[PDB]
Write a protein that binds this ligand. Structure first.
Ligand code: HEM
Ligand code: HEM
Ligand code: HEM
Ligand code: HEM
Lengths: 146, 141, 141, 146
């Protein structure tokens, strides 16, 4: 995870303006609407049959809040993503059985969600730093797969 | 495959794009060049400085061809035929790169079209770009 | 799109596999789980130990669908429709994994059928597993 | 390069048995035939219209030897793939303009090729270690891109 101080500053600064609860909700929802096969993991969440059903589902919203919560905490340990997410990695592999490729998909949607919210301020330079951060998190989450 | 709904969603969104397409094409490219530097290996004869005119001129071109495909949404493989031959026989860009570009167009559209970029639209736009990338890649071998 | 030379190549290679299809599918599976461990997440109900009966049976199953596809080379989408529904609507395996199993099937064939795994035959089997993979992910969204 | 002791040993021993001239010419040729669009970098080698023309082409053969020659020397530096291939990365990005994705393709062909030659001896365990080296080598070859 080679981020430059200018990049790290760019990532940390924008992140201060994010409302994680809501952004968390948009990103998990969109992921389930744009890549409907990712619903294989949430049969217990109830109705995910139409976009409104997904986006407004309370369970989808609470899980997105929880997913982004761990993400943010990662943003404060950008020099030790691997250690920060080790236990999470283990969980997603041995108990939940999640194909890591799904972390890459969420990363990319997150980037569309950030672009949608901040418009102009998500400049190309700022998107490049965020691509490196989403890739680094996805790799940290796959590190303990075996 | 695109559904009636997808086609309708893509026409609506691209309609709002209107005459900024070129500009959005260029931005898509610049985003691509900074986020995924490996993609610059296909443009070594280009000036890639910010604001460069080859990038702008090329952005327009990409945008015209996407605009053409929206105009011929029910006959895409035929409307894009020439571009498909060109990419398979002269340019020979590796297929993974098409996804990279498609991602950057989405980010670009999302940043400029807050109200139209709903979840349902994002989705349809994403299937749309994937179909375009599939056609341009269909004769590679 | 598979050419006549490809169809012909595929039929002849698969023909020599003949009765070892099941063993080879099982082998390929086994190579994929060891080489690409992420693929295991789709089989948490299976006993993945070497020589397990689940991997075995699953081996023959995949191998047979493949036979049915060589034998239906001209009409794959129809031939594989139900298998294509199964993957899009139930199993929901991420597209990326189809390339990993494909490569493992090539290596298994390269290793068992040396004389037949010529450069053009390798080319042709590679396009064929790709169209099968395309067919199997066609109704994902 | 998270290589296991018995993985390192599986790689070294098998390699000591490789005829680099042959394996190289076959690897590169097969790449040109199976992924025909890779011929874009090799316009100046001559006729490449057909598999026979590619596999017979002497410049293809010689360039193959050179490529596997450097991969070979890389197996002696497995603890330090990045530093070994630094210069080669710079050249591939700066003068050659080679999309690194091509490194993955050659890798996978390389592996089909070793199976074809060694048959029985190229067991699943042994393939698993070669997939690790090959990805490791591509990753190092791509490290200095900008
Ligand atoms: C940014 C990447 C991700 C992070 C940081 C993350 C984090 C978390 C956290 C903190 C939990 C709760 C842990 C617990 O229950 O003890 C969780 C659970 C879970 N996650 Fe992940 N997650 C990520 C991506 C994903 C994605 C992409 C998928 C699947 C598409 C997924 C599927 C699940 C499932 C099924 C649960 C358990 C839900 C339940 O309570 O039934 N996660 N994740
Ligand atoms: C959405 C997908 C794409 C579309 C619609 C598209 C369309 C076009 C068009 C219209 C041209 C102009 C050719 C002419 O003069 O008639 C072109 C050329 C070109 N494209 Fe594609 N393109 C796409 C993706 C890509 C990607 C992913 C790459 C590689 C990263 C790429 C690389 C090139 C290159 C190198 C040229 C030639 C540039 C020059 O030398 O002037 N394109 N493309
Ligand atoms: C050429 C590509 C493939 C073909 C032709 C194929 C074919 C099949 C067949 C014939 C079945 C059995 C259906 C039945 O019970 O009647 C099956 C099921 C299954 N496949 Fe696919 N498959 C392919 C690739 C993959 C991919 C790459 C994976 C993920 C790594 C995968 C995961 C599964 C799973 C988890 C099942 C259900 C297993 C069970 O519970 O018995 N398949 N597939
Ligand atoms: C296994 C990974 C690879 C390695 C280790 C490798 C290694 C090398 C080496 C040692 C040279 C000699 C450069 C010199 O003379 O100073 C070279 C040149 C070259 N490589 Fe790579 N290569 C790899 C993969 C590829 C790929 C896949 C391609 C394109 C598909 C490629 C394209 C080239 C080209 C175009 C040259 C220059 C040829 C010439 O002199 O005209 N390489 N490579």
């Amino acid at each position: 995870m080679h981020l430059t101080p200018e990049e790290k500053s760019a990532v940390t600064a924008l992140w201060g303006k994010v409302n994680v609860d809501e952004v968390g909700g948009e990103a998990l929802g969109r992921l389930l609407v744009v890549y409907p096969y990712t619903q294989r993991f949430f049969e217990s969440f109830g109705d995910l049959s139409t976009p409104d059903a997904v986006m407004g589902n309370p369970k989808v919203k609470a899980h997105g809040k929880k997913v982004l919560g761990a993400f943010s905490d990662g943003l404060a340990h950008l020099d030790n993503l691997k250690g920060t997410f080790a236990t999470l990695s283990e969980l997603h592999c041995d108990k939940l059985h999640v194909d890591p490729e799904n972390f890459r998909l969420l990363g990319n949607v997150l980037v569309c969600v950030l672009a949608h919210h901040f418009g102009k301020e998500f400049t190309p330079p700022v998107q490049a730093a965020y691509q490196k951060v989403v890739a680094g998190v996805a790799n940290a989450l796959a590190h303990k797969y075996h | 495959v695109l559904s009636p709904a997808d086609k309708t969603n893509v026409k609506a969104a691209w309609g709002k794009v209107g005459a900024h397409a070129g500009e959005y094409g260029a931005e898509a490219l610049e985003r691509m060049f900074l986020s995924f530097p490996t993609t610059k290996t296909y443009f070594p004869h280009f000036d890639l400085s910010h604001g460069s005119a080859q990038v702008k001129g090329h952005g327009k071109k990409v945008a015209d061809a996407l605009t053409n495909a929206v105009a011929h949404v029910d006959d895409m493989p035929n409307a894009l035929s020439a571009l498909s031959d060109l990419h398979a026989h002269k340019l020979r860009v590796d297929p993974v790169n098409f996804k990279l570009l498609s991602h950057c167009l989405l980010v670009t559209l999302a940043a400029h079209l807050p109200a139209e970029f709903t979840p349902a639209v994002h989705a349809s736009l994403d299937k749309f770009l994937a179909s375009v990338s599939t056609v341009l890649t269909s004769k590679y071998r």
